[PDB]
Design a protein around this ligand. Sequence first.
Ligand SMILES: Nc1ncnc2c1ncn2[C@@H]1O[C@H](COP(=O)(O)OP(=O)(O)O)[C@@H](O)[C@H]1O
Ligand SMILES: Nc1ncnc2c1ncn2[C@@H]1O[C@H](COP(=O)(O)OP(=O)(O)O)[C@@H](O)[C@H]1O
Ligand code: SF4
Ligand SMILES: [Mg+2]
Ligand SMILES: [Mg+2]
Lengths: 276, 274
Amino acid sequence: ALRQCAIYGKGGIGKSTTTQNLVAALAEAGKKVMIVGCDPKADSTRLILHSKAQGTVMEMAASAGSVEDLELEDVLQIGFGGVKCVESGGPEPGVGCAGRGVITAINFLEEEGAYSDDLDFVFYDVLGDVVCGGFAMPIRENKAQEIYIVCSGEMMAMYAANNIAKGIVKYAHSGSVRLGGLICNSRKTDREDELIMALAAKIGTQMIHFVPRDNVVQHAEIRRMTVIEYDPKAGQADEYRALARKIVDNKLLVIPNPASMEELEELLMEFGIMEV
Amino acid sequence: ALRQCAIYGKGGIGKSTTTQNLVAALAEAGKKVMIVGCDPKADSTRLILHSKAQGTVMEMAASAGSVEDLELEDVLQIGFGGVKCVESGGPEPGVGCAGRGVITAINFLEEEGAYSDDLDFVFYDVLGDVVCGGFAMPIRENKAQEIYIVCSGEMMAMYAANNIAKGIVKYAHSGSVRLGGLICNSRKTDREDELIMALAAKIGTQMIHFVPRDNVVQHAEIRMTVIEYDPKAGQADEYRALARKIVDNKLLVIPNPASMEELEELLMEFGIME
Ligand SMILES: Nc1ncnc2c1ncn2[C@@H]1O[C@H](COP(=O)(O)OP(=O)(O)O)[C@@H](O)[C@H]1O
Ligand SMILES: Nc1ncnc2c1ncn2[C@@H]1O[C@H](COP(=O)(O)OP(=O)(O)O)[C@@H](O)[C@H]1O
Ligand code: SF4
Ligand SMILES: [Mg+2]
Ligand SMILES: [Mg+2]
């Protein structure tokens, strides 16, 4: 019954906002969820916890002088709707591999039995600008069976989405990691929904949901909360509830067929975003 | 006499568009300069060479089966104003280290003595979303002495800029790597220039130049630089102004990175409601 998911996409695309909000809607519906932050920015749990930034696995390990000396209560926190929160963290910029905290955190959580019997979902919020090291680990090491990619009608967001799809293809034989769909997080661009639906069709997936751009998100976040908590009656709260419901009901889990750079350019040219 | 510089920033911020134009202005002023593309997107030399994509060091090494069997001739290309072009490349997504092409490329260029006697400048165009592996090598291994950052008024662009600064601090005692300044690449946001000038002041650097958002860039790219397409355009003078400012630069500091709270404080002060 436990379903392990990962939310990938380029930086600033809306992974943390989307994940925390959809998870808050899952908790609201009685689902037991854990969010594991896998982005060195380390603010993937702040809307669930109402914190400035949660102490990461790496910070606690460095403070303690060992990962082995740590216990679950050093790294795991319960927030809104009983959602469990862990933040991997990463080394300081310029030092080691930026994704090494992801490997450390996931192995620690497994060893400590953080993946309890009552848990219905686990969501990894993963940096997607590069798909290597610890960032590729949820895919490569079969940790997240359902991948959802947050993207937009921008080339860099589509390129990043297509690269994550390549990673899934590479490890398709190794486990049961599959692409569940694309989540279009609106940038208020004309034909954006059509472009992402076409990109989804081209690579053998679906655009599971279109998330509109809404200022209520900024209003909730400035108060360190999800829209679900800040204004449960807001239109945007229903958008996150619909996304959460569609992920729960999703049965389309595929080995994608990534597009070439020429094909990505062809799509953007067709939907007006690019010149010939 | 050779000065080695590096241009950092988040993906899609404009790194490749800025670099190929400031270097073009250096070449037209008689400077001998080489661009080493350190981004897996591998379209960092695309415009100066007037190509769709230059054959990367990784592709050529993979094609040859070894770096030892690789030649300088089929990795280095001369484009506009005699500018030398090298594209590092990277492995396939999900595989190895995304920055591996950078280590391979820089070590190959050194061994082949691509850093010739006549060369005045070397500009590394580095991916800045992560500061590790090959992307941190020009800083960590003292390859580029002058660092510069293309950013915008967006949180993720400023956050990226601040981490590059942290990387410079970490290796300040290991070599002579320093921060030269910030380059604001306009997203047509009100008070965006003030925000980047403030971020620069906060971390002990300068906003060396403000690059406006211009459609002439798209007109040139549809596959050459602005200085090649329309040297008389207003935008061509913008990059010329930047080039003058990097040679005339001596403000190369050990930065004082801001906290996340300080980055938020800056955005809250200048940033405007959508
Ligand atoms: N649907 C949305 N409507 C409005 N603002 C949004 C929406 N989704 C994300 N944002 C905003 O976009 C910015 C970046 O989002 P974030 O979730 O932190 O991205 P990521 O985790 O992918 O780096 C934040 O300022 C956030 O408030
Ligand atoms: N000053 C500018 N004016 C207009 N378009 C620009 C400007 N700078 C960059 N661009 C555009 O922004 C996009 C991304 O820029 P690029 O240099 O490829 O980014 P990066 O190398 O940082 O990923 C391209 O479509 C490019 O044409
Ligand atoms: S594998 Fe990825 S995250 Fe790790 S050092 Fe290389 S580029 Fe950085
Ligand atoms: Mg995030
Ligand atoms: Mg580039």
